[PDB]
Each structure stands twice: as C-alpha cells, then as structure tokens.
Scaffold this active site. Structure first.
Site, PDB file in Angstrom:
ATOM      1  N   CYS B 475     -29.370 -64.266  61.121  1.00  0.00           N
ATOM      2  CA  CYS B 475     -28.418 -64.328  60.097  1.00  0.00           C
ATOM      3  C   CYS B 475     -28.049 -65.739  59.431  1.00  0.00           C
ATOM      4  O   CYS B 475     -28.267 -65.862  58.239  1.00  0.00           O
ATOM      5  CB  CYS B 475     -26.824 -63.852  60.753  1.00  0.00           C
ATOM      6  SG  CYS B 475     -26.748 -64.635  62.399  1.00  0.00           S
ATOM      7  N   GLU B 477     -28.627 -69.225  61.561  1.00  0.00           N
ATOM      8  CA  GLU B 477     -28.767 -70.004  62.673  1.00  0.00           C
ATOM      9  C   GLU B 477     -29.669 -70.803  62.166  1.00  0.00           C
ATOM     10  O   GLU B 477     -31.032 -70.607  61.963  1.00  0.00           O
ATOM     11  CB  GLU B 477     -29.304 -69.480  63.722  1.00  0.00           C
ATOM     12  CG  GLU B 477     -27.994 -68.811  64.553  1.00  0.00           C
ATOM     13  CD  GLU B 477     -27.440 -67.913  64.049  1.00  0.00           C
ATOM     14  OE1 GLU B 477     -26.655 -68.048  62.950  1.00  0.00           O
ATOM     15  OE2 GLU B 477     -27.769 -66.454  64.092  1.00  0.00           O
TER      16      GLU B 477
HETATM   17  O1  LIG Z   1     -30.136 -61.849  65.468  1.00  0.00           O
HETATM   18  C1  LIG Z   1     -29.168 -62.177  64.846  1.00  0.00           C
HETATM   19  O2  LIG Z   1     -29.153 -63.124  64.200  1.00  0.00           O
HETATM   20  C2  LIG Z   1     -27.992 -61.831  65.576  1.00  0.00           C
HETATM   21  C3  LIG Z   1     -27.559 -62.420  66.527  1.00  0.00           C
HETATM   22  C4  LIG Z   1     -27.173 -63.925  66.317  1.00  0.00           C
HETATM   23  C5  LIG Z   1     -26.803 -64.794  67.539  1.00  0.00           C
HETATM   24  C6  LIG Z   1     -26.775 -64.214  68.740  1.00  0.00           C
HETATM   25  O3  LIG Z   1     -26.879 -64.943  69.945  1.00  0.00           O
HETATM   26  C7  LIG Z   1     -27.609 -62.832  68.888  1.00  0.00           C
HETATM   27  C8  LIG Z   1     -27.503 -61.950  67.926  1.00  0.00           C
END
Ligand SMILES: O=C(O)Cc1ccc(O)cc1
Ligand code: SF4
Ligand code: SF4
Lengths: 86, 869
Positions: B475, B477
């Site tokens: 999403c 990161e």
């Molecule tokens: O996959 C994703 O981006 C969602 C998600 C984000 C952070 C996390 O630690 C776990 C799932």
C-alpha cells in the site's frame, strides 16, 4: 467419472469449473457432475503407472523415482515429468 | 464517458464474480516432496529446487477468452499452505477433522478478526468444502494431504523453530502477553516477503535461457573460489547454482502453460477462442526461453515473475511497481511497428487487472481479515521522475489509467507519484479516475518519498538516481528502487525496479491506544483479566508521568517484539531464503548473494508499525485537558469512565464498530459530563494547536525511539504508520478511550486522517494539522478523505479534486486517498449485500468489494466524515 476427472475440465474454484468444450460452468459434486460421452481422462497420480497402494483418502506411493515417496490420487499429473498413463 | 470494457474482460469478470477463494495442495505437496528428497543439499540449491518444483509441477490453468494467462495455482482465486513457514493457524483444525472431533478455538488475534462472509470468501465449511482459516475453501479430500504435507514440519517451520529461540530471550513472556492481548497484531513470519517492489529487469533483459547461460558463466568463474571473502566468497557458487535451478523452474512452468494452451487449441471448435489459445501457446512457449519481443510477451513475462515470487512465500504487498515505465519500450515498439493498436494494449491492460485482482494471500485470519481484508496490495505506481530527473510519465501510463477506468476492479491499485514535473494532462487524467470513487489512483508525494529514501538509506549509499526509482511497496511502504539499463528496440532505457527486501516487516502494528489503556490500568488488560505488562505502580500524578509510563511500555514492547521478530526473519532468511526474488532483486546476481545474505542493494528496510495514532493523540489531548490542565476530572474518574464504556453498551454486544450507533444504557447519564468533556477536548485534524502539539511531539519521540532498535540486517528501525484494516482488530481489543471513542470499536483509520466525526474545521484544517512535522522523517503518513459525489461534479470537479491533492502535496503531505461515495449507499449495501456484488470502496491502501469487507471496517468506512464541498 465426473467433469472433474476430465482433461477438458478447466478449474475455477473449490466447487465448480468449466467444461472446455461447452464453456459452461460445471459442478464437482452432486447432480450435474458426471462425465459426458466426450470425456477424456485428465492426467492424475491416481491414474499413473507409478502410483500405487493408496489408503482410504487417496494417499499412496509414487515409484516414479528409485526412492519411493508418497503421493495423492487427485494430484494433477499433467506437469509431472515422470507421469505415465496406466 | 468511459468506454465499455472489452468483450473478453466482460466475460471473464462475469466468471470472476462467481468464484470462491480456494486453497489447494499441489504447490505445497511438490515443495515438501522436493525439499525432503533433497535433504542434505546445500540450502540455497535445496530451496531453489523445491520452489522450482512447486511451480513447475503444478496443473496450469487457462480459461477461455484469456489473452494473458497464469494464476498462483490451478484455481483462479487460488493459494496454498506453507507449513514450512507456519502451520499453527490450520494444522490443529485439520487434525481435529481427521479425528472427527471438535475444531479447537482460534488464537486471540485470529478470533478478533473478521473475514467478510460475502463475495468469494469461504468463512464456513459447506458440502465438500472445508473453510480453512475462515476464508479459504479446501476440498474435503485434500484435508488428509494437508495433514500429511504439514507433519514433517513439527518443531521446525520458521514459526516453531523461531519460537524455540524466542523462548530463550529474556522478554519471551512479555512478548507472548503482547501477542495474546493483540497489542502486536501478528508475527513477521506470517508474510516474510512483500511490502516491497518486485524488479522485473532480469528476465525482461535476458530471457531465461540468457539467465541460465549467465549462471553457467558465473559458476565456471567462481565455483570453488572465495576471492578475498572468507564469509560469502565460497557462497557465490551455490547462489549461481541455485539461480540456474529456479530459472529452469520458471522455464518449465511457462512451458506447461504452453502445452496446455496447445491442448485447448486442439479441441477448440470456436475459431475465435481457438486463436487466443494459439497466441498463448506461442507466447508462453516463447517466454519460457527467449527475451520477450513484443508487449504481450513482455507483460506476460512480468506476470510469470510476479506469480513466481508470490508463490515462494506467503505474502501480501508484492508491488508491481512502475509497470508503465518498465514496459514503455515494449509498448512503443509494438505501436510503432503496427503490431499492436492502443485499444489492443488497453484490452491486455484490462485483462491484467483481472489477473492481479485474483491474487490471494493464504495466511491466518488475523492477517487476511484482520489486516488485509483479503486484498493483496500489488500496487502499480505511475509517474515521478526518471533516471535523468525529468518527468517519468510515459504514454503507456495513460493506458494503465484508462484500463483502470474501463475495467473497474480492486487491483492493481494505482498510485500517482505526484511530482510538480508531471504533465497536467496526466494529472487530470489520473484525477478523473480517482473522482470515480474506485479509490484509485491514490496520491503520494514523490519528493517526500525520495527525501525519506535519501535519509533512511543514506548510510547504504542511496543517491539521487536510485532515490528517483523508489515507489510504494504494498500500500504505502515506501521502498527502495534503482534503474537498470534495458536494451530493446536498438536503444537503452533505464527502467525502474525495486532494490530492497520487505519494507513492511519488523515490529508489527502496535495498538498504541491499547498500550495507553494499560498505563491507566497498571499493566492489567481489563478486557481479559490478564496482567500483560509488569505493573508500574506509579501514581499518575502528572501528564508527564503518564506519558513517560506510556513511553516506557512502548519501549519494552518494541524491545521484546523486535528481538523475537528478528529471530523469526533470521530463521527464515537462513533456512528459507528467496529463490525467485533472489534471482530478480538487484544486486543479488551481481554480488552472488541472495536476499538472505544482503544481496539486495538496500537492506535498512525493517521497521516498526504503529496503529491508532489519532485515537492515541486524541486520548492524550483529552486526558491532559480534562484531568491535568483543567483538573475538571481525576485520572481515576477518567479511567473508570473508560472501563465502564461511558455507560454505553459495548460493541461486543451491539456489533456496531463506530460512533455511529451507541445504545445509551441508563449508566450513560452517570458519565454524560465526562463523556461530553472527552468528545469536546481538542481533537487532531482541526489546526487546533493543543492537539496538534501533542501530535507533533509524538512524531519526534517516535522517530527517536524506533531508530534505537536494530533489525536482523543490523540496521536501525524507522516508523511505518499505516492502518490497513488493523484498526478493526486492535480497535476490538481496546476498551473505550479518552477521546470518547467507545469499546470494541475501530481505531481511527490511517495515521494522519482525522478521527471520524472530529474534523469540524474543513479538509484544509486537516492538511495543516497533518503537516506540523516533516513527513519524510518517516516512511509514510496515511490520509483518507471521503467526498460526496456531488462534491466533484464536472470537469471542474475533476480539476477541484486535483487542486485539493496539489494543495496537500505542496504542504509536504505524503499521501491522500479518496472515497467518492454516498455513505447512505454503503449503509444500504450493508443491510443487503446480495444486492451490491460489484460495489467497491477504498479502505486504507486498498480497494475491496464491499461484500468481502467485515462489519467493523464497513462500519468504520460508513462513519468517515463526508465532505460536500
Ligand atoms: O500488503 C500490504 O501492503 C498490506 C500490509 C501492510 C503492512 C503489513 O505489515 C501487513 C500487510
Ligand atoms: S466430462 Fe464432458 S468434456 Fe469433460 S468437462 Fe466437458 S461436459 Fe465434463
Ligand atoms: S510419477 Fe508423477 S504423476 Fe506418477 S504418481 Fe509419481 S508424482 Fe504422480
């Protein structure tokens, strides 16, 4: 047999798939699941020459390699390099 | 108006909406068999071989009408279990079934998490389908295969082996209490890859035969040679041997699709459907060995890599990255030579959304419902700046947005790397898609992202060039990237691609409001009766004392969880290192090191995840206001009022998980004054300096805190602050909070969104609040806004929406995403979900079909503040 045991079956999910020929959705279990006369057996460990000894759940023995291992009858075999139609 | 989706796209979606999320065993069976059959092999090669086997021995599935093919498994919404990573969330269930006794109760995190019962989810066994982990249908005849495949992993999956070592850390007991209270949402082992950006460079540049020859050449050069490197020198040879093995795997896999396409063509009576099968057999036959030579092949090859990697581990958030830039050379050549028209490119991009939308993450309910709401976060980023620092927007990116408009699906979410250099027409195009209320594109600040990239990865050499190649892992990161020179069509293009391991792993979501709760309740979790933290026994005599006790508990929490999660990921990277991703990710191949041994260019990726930031800041505001500054209530008064849910019935009884509905039981007048004082205290997101100062101080403290810890890669942690769906579960286990939020109800969404119903000074006041600190101090900052559809009518409305984004971006804001929807519609869809099968809303970093979102998040989304202009 059922659609599910046919080579023309296209997998969708845990309950149904497509008949490649009709392109219509067909069930795995129950009313409507039986094979049609156009049936062609899908390649599976259950129908491999190397597959033997299965238990009540379809779990048996692969002899595809000199070292025997376990295998399951409904496992798709179309991409197993050692698969041999029984 | 928006053109209709292509015929193929329409037929495949008609099929798509009927599909059930299905776990099966092929990949798992083959991975396990090949693993043990190679017991004693050098680990890299043993791993590679087993992944290879797990891919290349599966049943390949091709559907009629598809142009682009492949899927994680033989099923369409398919996945499979990884008992070598973790199995505890299903093996007791599975064994209870063989034994025909009652399935045991879920663990706490799982049990406080809801998988939406509609759409594709299989939340309950039916007929011959067992519901695994409250979501995945597995056929009853496979349950025995699951049990027998999982058995040899007793004591030695990443889960169980890392648990044995965690038990030797001094903080093990503390850690276990934190997990059981759901103060920490889940374990890093759950999804040890993802929240990162795949790098498609190597096969797009070489093809697999090219890659196999490169491994042969490296093996001849280095096998048996250490150079001057007595740590990893010798390991180079085994790395190249392993890569040749995984590459042979990917090639066989493609060939299997080719062969199946060939079969299907041979029986296809309908000549039009037969054509596609024929093109597919050729395309898959080709990308099995050659460098791709047209756009269909090149995009198909990125799918082979993408499915490749998400099949080697359980994971979410393997970002596709900047596909429009990566594939621009293959697109432009096809259009130029008249091999493809744009409309044909748009059909492929349309079909591609389907393929990505069907990617599932098999994992425990805590992860799949509690965090992901089922979405797997394959985020496609657009724009930003290219290798030479100019606008990177390509003509192919316009078509990606177009495809997103014509074929409206949850994935891939689209992410604009908003940069002042971006053409207005692409921004407006992007905006016209957002204004639709699909929730994409979301908008992220290219400059702030690059700023974080230079800061965080500075010690590893990050320069302006790799910084520009960044985009969003999962999403939000923010994840390292670099450019690599793709030769194609007689020229070289620096295409971007990720350059780190996971950037959403480390200390997972800590429910900060719940930690505050335990300060006030002296370490004792009143929801459960369990003493979670050692009692501090301090009189909460000042604001400073209560905040210092909070910090002390946050630091203990961070310390013990970090040490256990390091062991988790360390066992994983040592006994379970990536095979496909170690081939793809630079600079593994150039260094002869896999991901586990820091072959990736950037390894300062491990982090600490907060959750409930605004709920938390607003509680502090309320306590400081009501208790310590104005002294209108005592800290005992506040605490009792919270424990007693301000007199209202709890969400554990009413199942309403927002402020939207409180059943006002008579004990409410008993707390009506303190409750109103709590709702009325200064609230973040109103440009109110009282609240905003607490928020600011939180940021400087949290940055300082996180960077004192060290990940398994030996790098300082930094803050990730998103919510995804986690405010559901961590909300659930939290009693009423001092901001007037009730018990069991969701925390505030995102991390810089205003708490629902508390923004009263308009969207711009939210912007001012959010930007009281420099967003690049951390990885990200997540803001959701909801607009009523009338609010963005007309091309003027598209422009107004873009100017809203520009305003926040120019203040430094990291991110904003929008819902454009009438909340009354969502209320209605909740009442009768059968009637809105195709309805989607934006949650947090993802779009999902309403019918697959659980009630707590649905409620939460319904209650978000709706802006009319
Ligand atoms: O996959 C994703 O981006 C969602 C998600 C984000 C952070 C996390 O630690 C776990 C799932
Ligand atoms: S058994 Fe016949 S061709 Fe095979 S899937 Fe098509 S209808 Fe069933
Ligand atoms: S040789 Fe292959 S197809 Fe035949 S039983 Fe063994 S694993 Fe199955």
């Amino acid at each position: 047999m059922r659609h599910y045991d046919c080579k023309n079956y296209i997998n969708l999910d845990c309950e149904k798939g497509l008949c490649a020929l009709t392109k219509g959705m067909v069930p795995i279990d129950g009313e409507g699941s039986e094979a049609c006369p156009n049936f062609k057996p899908a390649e599976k460990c259950g129908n491999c020459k190397n597959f033997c000894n299965p238990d009540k759940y379809g779990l048996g023995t692969c002899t595809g390699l000199e070292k025997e291992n376990w295998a399951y009858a409904t496992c798709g075999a179309s991409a197993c390099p050692s698969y041999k139609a029984e | 108006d928006i053109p209709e989706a292509k015929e193929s796209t329409q037929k495949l979606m008609d099929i798509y909406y009927t599909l059930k999320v299905t776990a099966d065993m092929e990949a798992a069976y083959w991975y396990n068999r090949t693993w043990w059959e190679n017991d004693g092999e050098v680990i890299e090669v043993r791993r590679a071989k087993a992944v290879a086997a797990s891919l290349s021995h599966m049943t390949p599935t091709i559907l009629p009408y598809e142009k682009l093919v492949m899927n994680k498994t033989k099923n369409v919404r398919g996945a499979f279990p990884f008992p070598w990573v973790c199995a505890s969330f299903f093996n007791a269930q599975a064994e209870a079934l063989m034994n025909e006794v009652d399935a045991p109760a879920e663990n706490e995190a799982d049990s406080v998490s809801v998988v939406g019962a509609g759409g594709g989810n299989v939340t309950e066994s039916y007929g011959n389908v067992i519901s695994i982990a409250k979501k995945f249908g597995m056929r009853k005849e496979e349950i025995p295969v699951l049990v027998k495949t999982s058995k040899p992993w007793e004591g030695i999956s990443v889960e169980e082996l890392s648990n044995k070592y965690s038990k030797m850390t001094p903080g093990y007991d503390q850690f276990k209490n934190i997990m059981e209270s759901v103060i920490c949402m889940f374990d890093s082992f759950a999804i040890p890859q993802g929240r990162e950006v795949i790098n498609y460079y190597m096969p797009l540049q070489y093809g697999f035969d090219g890659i196999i020859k490169l491994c042969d050449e490296k093996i001849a050069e280095v096998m048996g040679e250490a150079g001057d490197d007595g740590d990893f020198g010798m390991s180079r040879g085994y790395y190249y041997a392993a890569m040749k093995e995984i590459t042979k795997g990917l090639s066989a896999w493609c060939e299997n699709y080719s062969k199946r396409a060939k079969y299907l063509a041979s029986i296809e009576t309908d000549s039009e459907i037969k054509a596609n099968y024929e093109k597919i057999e050729e395309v898959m036959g080709n990308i099995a060995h050659k460098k791709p030579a047209n756009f269909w092949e090149a995009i198909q090859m990125t799918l082979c890599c993408h499915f490749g990697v998400v099949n080697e581990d359980p994971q979410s958030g393997l970002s596709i990255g900047r596909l429009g830039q990566v594939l621009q050379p293959f697109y432009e050549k096809d259009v130029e030579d008249g091999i493809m028209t744009d409309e044909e490119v748009i059909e492929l991009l349309e079909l591609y959304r389907i393929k990505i939308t069907c990617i599932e993450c098999f994992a425990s309910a805590g992860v799949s419902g509690g965090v992901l709401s089922g979405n797997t976060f394959n985020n496609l980023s657009l724009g930003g700046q290219n290798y030479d620092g100019l606008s990177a927007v390509t003509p192919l990116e316009y078509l990606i947005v177009e495809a997103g408009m014509r074929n409206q699906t949850p994935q891939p979410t689209l992410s604009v790397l908003y940069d002042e250099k971006t053409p207005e027409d692409f921004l407006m195009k992007a905006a016209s898609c957002t204004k639709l209320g699909l929730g994409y594109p979301a908008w992220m600040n290219n400059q702030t992202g690059m700023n974080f990239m230079m800061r965080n990865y500075g010690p590893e050499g990050m320069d302006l060039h790799d910084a520009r190649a960044w985009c969003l892992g999962g999403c939000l990161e923010s994840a390292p990237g670099c450019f690599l020179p793709l030769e194609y069509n007689g020229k070289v293009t620096m295409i971007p691609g990720g350059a780190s391991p996971t950037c959403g792993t480390g200390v997972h979501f800590i429910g900060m409001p719940k930690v505050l709760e335990l300060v006030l309740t002296n370490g004792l979790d009143k929801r459960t009766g369990k003493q979670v933290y050692p009692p501090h026994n301090k009189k909460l005599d000042s604001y400073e004392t209560m905040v210092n006790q909070w910090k002390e508990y946050m630091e203990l929490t961070t310390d013990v969880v970090n040490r256990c999660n390091n062991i988790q990921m360390d066992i994983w990277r040592k006994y379970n290192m990536p095979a496909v991703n170690s081939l793809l990710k630079p600079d593994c191949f150039k260094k002869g090191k896999h991901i586990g041994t820091m072959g990736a260019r950037y390894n300062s990726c491990i982090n600490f995840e907060s959750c409930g930031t605004i709920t938390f800041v607003n509680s502090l505001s309320s306590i400081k206001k009501n208790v310590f500054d104005d002294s209108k209530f005592t800290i005992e008064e506040m605490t009792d009022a919270m424990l007693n849910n301000f007199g209202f019935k709890t969400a554990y009884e009413t199942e309403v998980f927002s402020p939207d509905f409180r059943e006002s039981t008579d004990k409410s007048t008993k707390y009506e004054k303190i409750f109103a004082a709590c709702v009325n205290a200064p609230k973040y997101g109103n440009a109110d300096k009282y609240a905003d100062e607490i928020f600011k101080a939180y940021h400087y403290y949290i940055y300082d805190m996180t960077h004192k810890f060290r990940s398994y890669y030996g790098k300082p942690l930094y803050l990730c602050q998103i919510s995804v769906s986690t405010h559901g579960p961590q909300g659930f286990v939290t009693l009423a909070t001092a901001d007037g939020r009730l018990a069991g109800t969701t925390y505030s969404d995102g991390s810089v969104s205003a708490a629902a119903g508390t923004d009263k000074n308009g969207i711009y006041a939210i912007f001012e609040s959010a930007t009281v600190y420099d967003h690049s101090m951390h990885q990200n900052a997540q803001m959701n806004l909801k607009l009523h559809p009338t609010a963005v009518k007309g091309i003027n409305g598209t422009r107004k929406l873009l100017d809203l984004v520009r305003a926040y971006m120019r203040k430094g804001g990291f991110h904003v995403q929008f819902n454009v929807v009438d909340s009354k519609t969502l209320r209605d869809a909740q009442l009768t979900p059968e009637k809105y099968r195709e309805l989607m809303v934006r949650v947090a970093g993802f779009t999902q079909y309403w019918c697959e979102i659980g009630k707590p998040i649905q409620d939460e989304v319904i209650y978000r503040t709706e802006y009319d202009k």
